[PDB]
Amino acid sequence: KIPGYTYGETENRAPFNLEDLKLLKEAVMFTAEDEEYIQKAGEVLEDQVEEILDTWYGFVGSHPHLLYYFTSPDGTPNEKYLAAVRKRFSRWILDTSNRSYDQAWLDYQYEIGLRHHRTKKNQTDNVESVPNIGYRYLVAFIYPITATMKPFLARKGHTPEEVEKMYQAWFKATTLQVALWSYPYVKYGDF
Amino acid sequence: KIPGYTYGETENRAPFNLEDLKLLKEAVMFTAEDEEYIQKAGEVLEDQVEEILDTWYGFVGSHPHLLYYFTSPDGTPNEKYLAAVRKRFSRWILDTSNRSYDQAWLDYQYEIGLRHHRTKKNQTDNVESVPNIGYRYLVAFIYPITATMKPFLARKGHTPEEVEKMYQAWFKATTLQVALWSYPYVKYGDF
Ligand code: HEM
Ligand code: HEM
Numbered sequence: 108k109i110p111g112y113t114y115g116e117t118e119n120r121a122p123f124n125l126e127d128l129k130l131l132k133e134a135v136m137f138t139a140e141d142e143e144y145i146q147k148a149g150e151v152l153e154d155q156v157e158e159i160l161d162t163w164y165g166f167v168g169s170h171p172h173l174l175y176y177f178t179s180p181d182g183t184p185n186e187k188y189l190a191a192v193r194k195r196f197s198r199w200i201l202d203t204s205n206r207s208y209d210q211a212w213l214d215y216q217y218e219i220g221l222r223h224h225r226t227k228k229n230q231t232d233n234v235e236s237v238p239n240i241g242y243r244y245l246v247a248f249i250y251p252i253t254a255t256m257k258p259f260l261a262r263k264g265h266t267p268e269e270v271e272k273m274y275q276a277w278f279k280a281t282t283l284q285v286a287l288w289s290y291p292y293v294k295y296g297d298f
Numbered sequence: 299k300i301p302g303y304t305y306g307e308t309e310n311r312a313p314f315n316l317e318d319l320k321l322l323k324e325a326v327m328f329t330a331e332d333e334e335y336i337q338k339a340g341e342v343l344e345d346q347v348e349e350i351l352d353t354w355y356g357f358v359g360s361h362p363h364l365l366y367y368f369t370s371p372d373g374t375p376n377e378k379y380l381a382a383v384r385k386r387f388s389r390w391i392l393d394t395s396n397r398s399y400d401q402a403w404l405d406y407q408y409e410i411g412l413r414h415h416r417t418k419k420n421q422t423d424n425v426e427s428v429p430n431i432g433y434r435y436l437v438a439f440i441y442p443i444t445a446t447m448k449p450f451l452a453r454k455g456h457t458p459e460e461v462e463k464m465y466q467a468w469f470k471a472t473t474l475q476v477a478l479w480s481y482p483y484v485k486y487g488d489f
Contacts, residue, residue, distance in 0.1 A: 127434075134438035136445060172321050225488065242484045243318075246437060246477035247325035248471050254327060278472050279441050286437035293433045293483050297416065 111231035112195050114202065114215045121210075123291060128213060129149040135283050142274040144206075148273035149204025152256070156197050162255050164193065176240050188234045203280050209237035213287070220288035240293040245285050253278045302422035305406045307394065312401075312408035313481060318399050319404060332467040333399075339464035340395025342454040343447070347388050353446050355384065367431050375436045377402050379425045394471050404478070411479035433483040434474050 131143050132138070152159065167173045168184070177192070179185045199219075220226040225239040253274070260273045290298050323329070343350065358364045359375070368383070370376045390410075397403050412418040416430040444465070449465045481489050 120438060131438055133361055134435050148428045170324055173325065194320065239488055241489050242480050243322060243477045244325050245479060246440075246473060247322055249437075249440060249475050250326045253469075278444075281439060282441050284432045289433050289437060289480070289483075292480075292485060292488050294485055297430055297483050298433050 109194050109198055110191055112198055113218065114198075115211045117214050117218050119214060119217070121213045123213055123217070125210060125213070128208060131283060131286060132208075134288070135279045136148065137276075137279045137283060140272075141279055144269070144272040144277040145204050146255075146281055147265075147269065147275055148260060149201060150198055151260055151265060151273065152204065155259045155262065156200055159200065159255065159259055160193055160197055163180060163196070163252075166251055166255065173244070176237055176244075178236060180235060184233055185236055187234050188229075188236060191232045195292075203277070204286070216284060216287040219284070220291050221289060226289040226291050229281070242289060245288055245292075249278075249281050249285050252281045300389055301382055303389055304409065305389075305397075306402045308405050308407070308409050310405060312404045314404055314408070314478065316401060316404070319399060322474060322477060323399075326470045326477070328467075328470045330345075331434070331463075335460070336361050336395050336462040336467040336471055338456075338460065339447075339451060339468055340392060342451055342456060342464065343391055344387055346450045346453065346460055347391055350391065350446065350450055351384055354387070354443075357446065361488055364435070365437075367428055369427060371426060376425055376427055379420075379423050379427060382423045396477070407412065407475060407478040408481060410475070411482050412474070414479060415482040417482050433480060436479055440469075440472050440476050443472045478483060 142158060147297055166186075167177070174184055177184050177189050200216075202212075218227075222231060223240045223245060229236045230288050260277070261267070261270050265273075358368070365375055368375050368380050392408075393403075409418075413422060414431045415433075418468060419430060420427045421458075447468050448465055451468070452458070452461050
């Protein structure tokens with residue numbers, strides 16, 4: 108159904124476990140309250156996903172040095188690559204809100220890190236593109252990912268107090284994930 | 299005056315330049331509007347720094363796996379290390395708000411990265427402590443650094459609209475810096 112999407116079936120145990128996740132949740136101040144509100148964020152965002160994708164890919168597409176990461180060697184955007192990734196990105200919005208953050212979730216977080224990194228970039232879709240996404244931009248993107256989501260959370264007729272709690276949960280969850288995705292980028296033993 | 303604080307006098311040119319910084323600012327959505335409001339954040343936070351430090355170090359100190367990074371080999375917090383770092387952290391609050399983000403600023407961002415990493419950790423204060431701060435926690439800390447600051451920004455009798463703009467500027471600036479600090483942690487050529 109979603110080409111290349113292998114959540115829960117990588118058959119590869121990540122190099123981090125639930126104890127690692129507990130300590131990382133503590134560092135990012137994520138608790139059971141955020142679990143509640145991230146789920147509620149999923150209810151709000153579910154039927155706005157197409158517009159979210161348009162916004163997100165609009166941001167990427169308007170910056171040549173960002174759109175770069177989806178380009179063919181000739182410098183033009185690879186439209187097959189963009190379309191296939193867009194489907195998996197859309198699903199990630201739902202996963203972030205709806206999935207339990209358990210070992211299967213960690214195993215896919217390792218996978219997503221590997222796919223941004225040179226280790227696995229451009230293999231899932233069998234495309235020819237740039238070899239690596241510089242780690243600096245994964246961290247930077249914590250901000251726009253959070254900023255893209257804010258207006259959409261405010262839209263579904265929920266209380267502003269609930270909106271703030273959903274937004275903070277989303278900020279924490281995005282930060283948590285990017286922290287895990289540093290694994291293949293970071294010198295062994297420094298993560 | 300501040301022991302170990304060597305901003306603007308490292309005499310070492312960072313491996314990133316103003317073009318790198320321009321592209322990273324674009325990725326984190328930082329503009330001249332944020333320059334304005336981060337400066338205004340500095341006016342607000344200046345006379346609350348002691349309370350900010352208490353909050354921040356309170357968070358670190360209440361989590362044994364975080365306080366770990368300041369511990370002597372015997373597992374007890376090194377109080378000399380805590381005190382010396384606290385002075386440089388306090389100054390960093392002001393620097394973030396007040397400094398122009400120019401080459402000198404980049405050169406100190408490289409330095410701060412090096413000091414969290416095993417490359418330079420525990421050398422500035424000539425202490426014996428744990429060798430490295432795992433990069434996962436630098437990313438994670440983007441959230442509490444931003445969450446610690448929010449209440450203080452809301453305190454100095456400014457409009458809530460200005461408060462929101464100061465807070466967003468602070469979020470962007472913190473993310474920007476952590477992205478740069480990945481440099482010594484990231485495999486060469488993957489940053
Ligand atoms: C907060 C930061 C980021 C988030 C949340 C994010 C999210 C995602 C997701 C969910 C996927 C699909 C994962 C899967 O295969 O199931 C993906 C892949 C991809 N992302 Fe990101 N991403 C981030 C940073 C970046 C940056 C900075 C770029 C640069 C434009 C980028 C470009 C791409 C590309 C090119 C792929 C395809 C990688 C491949 O060949 O498999 N991502 N991203
Ligand atoms: C957003 C993330 C972080 C920020 C903004 C931050 C800020 C700072 C600053 C401003 C300094 C002093 C720099 C200087 O020497 O002038 C410092 C040093 C230090 N920080 Fe962080 N820090 C972050 C992440 C962390 C984490 C996750 C830990 C773990 C507890 C930590 C523990 C320390 C320690 C132990 C030092 C002393 C390093 C040395 O030996 O030189 N920091 N930090």
